[model samples]
Target: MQEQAQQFIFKVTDKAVEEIKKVAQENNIENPILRIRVVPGGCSGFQYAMGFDDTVEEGDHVFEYDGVKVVIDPFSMPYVNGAELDYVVDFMGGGFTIRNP
Candidate 1:
């Protein structure tokens, strides 16, 4: 599939995009990349892995929302397609959350 087509598979919320920008600035990571992966091992058969990355290797799919960039490898794209990423805050804590249906 084309690289552009893969990016359309995932969605990023405004809140998420803001949070990503904030985190990158706070950590002094220039042009940060949000890398998300779906790995095998969960009780339901798969698990999610996410973190900041600076490198975009082969087969990586990149998407942008509100200027924030998100990257997903080819293998993980299928699992995360149609998923929406959001940032949440409460008395407990604040973090990124993914909603998939």
Candidate 2:
């Protein structure tokens, strides 16, 4: 296959890349594929949960940042066309933030 540059469907940062890989290795998750998708929600409209999967499925958008392979599943996929995925520490608490434009 030839190298083709299409519109970037997904984007991730080094902070998240490094953090995800660390967790992947610690959990012995070889062949890591991080899956972020929407599940059932309560007060909030959408509840997003992510975990390491060993394989990719159809209707999944795959992305690579540094050494991390991330997949934002179907629902979250369409909603996050221009968002930046990052992991950062806030004062004392640490968490992940996916920012939209």
User: For this target, which candidate reaches the highest TM-score against the unseen true structure?
Assistant: 1
Where does candidate 2 stray beyond 4 Å?
1-8, 39-47, 89-93
Model 1: ten consecutive residues of lowest lDDT: 41-50
Output the worst ten-in-a-row residue range by lDDT, candidate 2: 1-10
Q: Go through the candidates in order and give each one's C-alpha lDDT.
A: 0.67, 0.64
- How do the residues 1-101 of candidate 1 rate in per-residue lDDT, one tens digit apiece? 55455545777776666566767877787576888776555554344645667777676777765666678777777767877766555443355466777
Q: List, residue by residue over 1-101, the lDDT tens digit for candidate 2.
A: 44433333777677666666766777876556777776665663343545677776664667765666677766677767867666664453346566777
Q: Candidate 1: what lDDT?
A: 0.67
Checking candidate 1 for backbone clashes, the offending pairs are none
Q: Cα lDDT for residue 70, model 2?
A: 71
- Candidate 2 lDDT score relative to the true structure: 0.64
